[PDB]
């Protein structure tokens, strides 16, 4: 049972790790930063959970 | 950059000679298969071998 | 100012909750955090 609980916690930690990395890169973006381009459609695409 | 348009002769010949244009089993105007004996009768429908 | 008042008060209550866990009030035994757990 302890193994099952730890497995759930490990998945949660890995997912939050990836999400935090993406959110940091989004927060620190700037107006003429590298790799900024048009992405028409993303303002209408909505596939949240 | 200035190009003259194509004539009706050329346009019809290109449509006839297109790689993608296809023909079918010579259906009726209503949309039914035309009988093989009808096509054998050398009349309003012919044979395509 | 009213939101600060709670956070100052609440930090006191969290701080006073360290009167427990004193090495003479409890006996925590040693803990093997650095391990490769075997329940896999």
């Amino acid at each position: 049972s302890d193994r099952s609980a730890q497995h759930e916690l490990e998945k949660d930690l890995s997912d939050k790790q990836a999400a935090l990395r993406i959110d940091d890169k989004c927060q620190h973006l700037r107006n003429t930063s590298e790799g900024v381009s048009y992405f028409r459609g993303v303002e209408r695409v909505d596939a949240t959970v | 950059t200035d190009l003259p348009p194509l004539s009706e002769k050329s346009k019809w010949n290109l449509l006839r000679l297109s790689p993608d244009y296809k023909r079918t089993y010579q259906t009726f105007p209503s949309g039914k298969r035309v009988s093989s004996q009808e096509r054998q009768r050398r009349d309003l429908y012919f044979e395509f071998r | 100012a009213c939101k600060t008042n709670t956070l100052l008060l609440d930090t006191k209550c969290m701080d006073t909750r360290r009167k427990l866990t004193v090495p003479a009030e409890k006996f925590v035994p040693q803990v093997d955090t650095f391990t490769r757990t075997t329940n896999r």
């Binding site: 973006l29 048009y38 303002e43 909505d46 959970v49 | - | -």
Partner: protein
């Protein structure tokens, strides 16, 4: 407009449980909308000029 669309694209990559509709997501969508309206107003004034 470019940087807003880039932020939205990157935040589409969040993992399954983290794929959340957050207030920042709403704000970015609204920001893209407003930038488009601003561009339209400027083009209108250009034509009038």
């Amino acid at each position: 407009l470019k940087v807003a669309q880039t932020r939205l694209d990157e935040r589409t990559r969040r993992p399954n449980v983290e794929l959340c509709r957050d207030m920042a997501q709403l704000r970015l969508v609204n920001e893209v909308y407003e930038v488009d309206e601003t561009i339209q107003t400027l083009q209108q004034r250009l034509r009038d000029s």
